[PDB]
Amino acid sequence: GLFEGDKFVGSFESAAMGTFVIDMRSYETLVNSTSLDRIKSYANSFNKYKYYTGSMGEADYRMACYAHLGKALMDYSVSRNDKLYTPPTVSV
Amino acid sequence: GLFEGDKFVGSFESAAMGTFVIDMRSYETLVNSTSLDRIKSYANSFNKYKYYTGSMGEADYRMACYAHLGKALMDYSVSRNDKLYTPPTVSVNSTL
């Protein structure tokens, strides 16, 4: 689960695939358990996955998600706007 | 990654996600390590996984892969035409 009671508790990995609001408290939680360096890296691969088109091998589904959560967190850090996170659409 | 040297060596699972040519040698390999019964089953879930309801979790994709490789193998068994296998095509889109 992403929550335990009323506060966000997910890892970056679970989170990346779930639905939750990025606010100062969830952000605080993630950054402090991942932290900022991995997140930045994940964020980097965002263009690589913003419109990822083609076959995924293993592996890639996960990275897509990690990449999107990554960017979302980086955007939040820049402009402190609470915003809802949901995983990207992966369709055939 | 599906290859000792020059010959195919992948499991059904790795293979299902990778790129390789289905020919009599890779077919022989897979059938003899999976075998024909699981493959047939996987093959059966194919139509489901052709016109899927968009996304389609992690999960779902893995299966679509197994299903996809499954059918390819069954087709090859029927008509022995060497054919390239690649995992199924996807689109990834954001969601605000």
From Swiss-Prot, chain A:
Topology relative to the membrane: Multi-pass membrane protein
Top-level lineage group: Viruses
Subcellular localization, as worded in the UniProt entry: Host membrane
Sequence ranges assigned to domain Nsp4C in this UniProt record: 2-92
Protein name according to UniProt: Non-structural protein 4
Covered residues, full protein: 2808 to 2898 of 6709
Swiss-Prot record, chain B:
Localization, UniProt: Host membrane
Bilayer topology: Multi-pass membrane protein
Domain called Nsp4C: residue spans: 2-96
Origin superkingdom: Viruses
Protein name listed in UniProt: Non-structural protein 4
Gene: rep
